[PDB]
Design a binder for this molecule. Structure first.
Ligand SMILES: Nc1nc2c(ncn2[C@@H]2O[C@H](COC(=O)NCCc3c[nH]c4ccccc34)[C@@H](O)[C@H]2O)c2nccn12
Lengths: 115, 113
């Protein structure tokens, strides 16, 4: 079982269903099961990285790819007025799944501060 | 890099509390902090907004995140932190120069705005 047994690892291997937006060799974009905005999806690497605080230097282009795929998916989903991208690290950041992931939220006015 | 206040900061024309600099990005404390630690990591290249980032900019964007997580560690954020990129009016984007927010030193809540 390449990629581990977090919920996200299982989604990657099609063991747990998800509503997929986009998939390539590096990443997967899918809707969040508990959306906090009219549109709320995740972009995750297929490579399992537990949390951004332990990402390797060589993980740079992968992390970038999450954001590029995120912004392309937002455009394809018609988030013309904009959106917010969030990565949470650890307890104070509010991480509940220990597989790196990029939240993309839009379809309403997002407020400040961002939690 | 650019016709925004962040361009002035990169060019050292106005003061900012600089945390880290290299040949392609700058990290500095936010003047309007929303948490006990709240800094920005910005590219020196003037990309106005994430929505217009080019494919070739992928590893530069990733670099902002790696620099952010290294700065966060250096600033003592061992209990965690939140990274944010705002796009456009719904995203609450305040400056049209791509910037990664890094916030910590308190419990960050949900939703993220
Ligand atoms: N599609 C889909 N999505 C899922 C599934 N299981 C989990 N997720 C989503 O993963 C995200 C992880 O977010 C965080 O790790 N921190 C953000 C939220 C958070 C958790 N604890 C906190 C504590 C403080 C502040 C924020 C938070 C959440 O938004 C979940 O709704 C799932 N199973 C089948 C399909 N599934």
């Amino acid at each position: 079982r390449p990629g581990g047994d977090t919920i996200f690892g299982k989604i990657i291997r099609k063991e747990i269903p998800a509503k997929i937006i986009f998939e390539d060799d590096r990443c997967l974009a899918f809707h969040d099961i508990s959306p906090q905005a009219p549109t709320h999806f995740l972009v995750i690497p297929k490579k399992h990285i537990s949390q951004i605080s332990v990402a390797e230097d060589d993980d740079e282009s992968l992390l970038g790819h999450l954001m590029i795929v995120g912004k392309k998916c937002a455009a394809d989903l018609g988030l013309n007025k904009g959106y917010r991208m969030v990565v949470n690290e650890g307890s104070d950041g509010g991480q509940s799944v220990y597989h790196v992931h990029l939240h993309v939220l839009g379809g309403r006015q997002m407020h400040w501060p961002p939690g």
